[PDB]
Amino acid sequence: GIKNLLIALGGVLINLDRERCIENFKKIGFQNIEEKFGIFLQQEKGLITPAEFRDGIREMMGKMVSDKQIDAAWNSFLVDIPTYKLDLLLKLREKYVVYLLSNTNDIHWKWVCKNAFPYRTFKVEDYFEKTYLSYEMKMAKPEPEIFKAVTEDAGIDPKETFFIDDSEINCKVAQELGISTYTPKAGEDWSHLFR
Ligand SMILES: [Mg+2]
Numbered sequence: 001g002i003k004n005l006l007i008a009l010g011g012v013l014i015n016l017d018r019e020r021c022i023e024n025f026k027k028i029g030f031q032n033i034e035e036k037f038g039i040f041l042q043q044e045k046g047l048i049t050p051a052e053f054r055d056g057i058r059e060m061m062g063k064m065v066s067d068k069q070i071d072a073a074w075n076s077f078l079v080d081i082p083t084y085k086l087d088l089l090l091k092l093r094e095k096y097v098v099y100l101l102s103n104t105n106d107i108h109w110k111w112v113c114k115n116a117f118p119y120r121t122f123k124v125e126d127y128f129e130k131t132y133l134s135y136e137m138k139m140a141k142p143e144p145e146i147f148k149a150v151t152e153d154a155g156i157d158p159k160e161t162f163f164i165d166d167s168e169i170n171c172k173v174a175q176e177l178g179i180s181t182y183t184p185k186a187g188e189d190w191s192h193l194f195r
Contacts, residue, residue: 008165046135
């Protein structure tokens with residue numbers, strides 16, 4: 001009897017495009033961008049600041065570039081949330097409590113909130129009871145920490161929580177804590193889970 005849902009961000013909701021990102025980075029002067037990915041892991045845990053991140057990018061980049069240029073290229077990894085997934089979220093809150101559990105960074109998070117979640121009258125606030133972000137939490141999937149940490153703050157029973165995330169390891173760890181999981185494939189429309 002599932003009462004709650006935990007949803008990942010990437011692939012599951014927002015389409016990703018590594019090639020594009022790589023290319024945009026190269027265009028702005030980062031030659032070995034693809035070997036490079038450090039600060040990414042730190043950023044993800046919010047152990048540094050967007051400021052220091054850009055500096056790190058510049059620093060290993062060997063050139064001075066605009067923060068906008070950098071945010072631009074970094075955000076090009078994100079494509080879009082097909083709007084039918086947004087409908088699905090809203091429809092789902094009718095029968096469940098719905099949380100986001102996402103490994104991400106402030107720069108990305110602000111892009112998705114401005115550019116991807118806004119739909120009709122709705123805003124990121126409208127889809128989730130609460131969003132748990134790695135870089136705010138300071139811990140990241142698949143640390144067991146983060147899963148236990150989420151249920152306690154949320155005050156939800158793990159036995160009654162369904163976790164949807166396209167990373168196997170993340171799912172296996174969540175299962176250990178008693179959570180049920182589905183691992184969607186790239187591009188998968190996982191709406192079939194509720195037919
Ligand atoms: Mg993923």
